[PDB]
Design an enzyme around this catalytic site. Structure first.
Site, short mmCIF file in Angstrom:
data_model
loop_
_atom_site.label_atom_id
_atom_site.label_comp_id
_atom_site.label_asym_id
_atom_site.label_seq_id
_atom_site.Cartn_x
_atom_site.Cartn_y
_atom_site.Cartn_z
CG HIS A 12 47.12 16.11 23.91
ND1 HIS A 12 47.27 14.79 24.32
CD2 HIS A 12 45.98 16.13 23.17
CE1 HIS A 12 46.28 14.03 23.84
NE2 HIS A 12 45.50 14.84 23.13
CE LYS A 41 42.40 10.96 26.51
NZ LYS A 41 43.27 10.42 25.47
CG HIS A 119 43.26 13.78 16.72
ND1 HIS A 119 42.97 12.82 17.68
CD2 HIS A 119 43.86 13.11 15.69
CE1 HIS A 119 43.38 11.63 17.25
NE2 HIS A 119 43.91 11.79 16.05
CG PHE A 120 48.97 13.78 20.38
CD1 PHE A 120 49.49 12.50 20.25
CD2 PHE A 120 49.83 14.83 20.53
CE1 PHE A 120 50.85 12.28 20.24
CE2 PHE A 120 51.20 14.63 20.52
CZ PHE A 120 51.71 13.35 20.40
CG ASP A 121 46.89 10.74 13.92
OD1 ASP A 121 45.76 10.30 14.25
OD2 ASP A 121 47.49 10.27 12.95
CL LIG Z 1 47.42 10.82 23.10
CL LIG Z 2 43.30 13.84 21.11
#
Ligand SMILES: [Cl-]
Ligand SMILES: [Cl-]
Ligand SMILES: [Cl-]
Ligand SMILES: [Cl-]
Ligand SMILES: [Cs+]
Length: 124
Positions: A12, A41, A119-121
């Site tokens: 990210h 992905k 984590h990217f929520d």
């Molecule tokens: Cl993402």
């Molecule tokens: Cl993530």
């Protein structure tokens, strides 16, 4: 082997640019960050803010994660982000992505010591 914090950074962060360049930005970043290596992905967001500003979200507004966990935090201001999403016609190994630049609040899950994003929520 890669820590949760290091994986978050690799997937990210993109502080070298203020915003998604061209429509080809996602195809070059998904590849250069080794995200099309074993498969394509399907979705991934890149944040164009300094690491220190993303890390400070862990001390901002505490909200529920989509999965019901409570260690998610929503940034107070909007941030520059780029959404990368595979197109209907993407096929590993020929991964193809649609780049969408936007300015919104990010929601990240934080953990550890130091307590950093893992984590990217979502974005709002
Ligand atoms: Cl993402
Ligand atoms: Cl993530
Ligand atoms: Cl680390
Ligand atoms: Cl890698
Ligand atoms: Cs900002």
């Amino acid at each position: 082997k890669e820590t949760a914090a290091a994986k978050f950074e690799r997937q990210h962060m993109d502080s070298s640019t203020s915003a998604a360049s061209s429509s080809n930005y996602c195809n070059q970043m998904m590849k250069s960050r080794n995200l099309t290596k074993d498969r394509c992905k399907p979705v991934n967001t890149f944040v164009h803010e300094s690491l220190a500003d993303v890390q400070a979200v862990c001390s901002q507004k505490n909200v529920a994660c989509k999965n019901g966990q409570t260690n998610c935090y929503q940034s107070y201001s909007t941030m520059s982000i780029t959404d990368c999403r595979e197109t209907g016609s993407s096929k590993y190994p020929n991964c193809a992505y649609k780049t969408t630049q936007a300015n919104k609040h990010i929601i990240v899950a934080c953990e550890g010591n130091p307590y950093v994003p893992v984590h990217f929520d979502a974005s709002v």
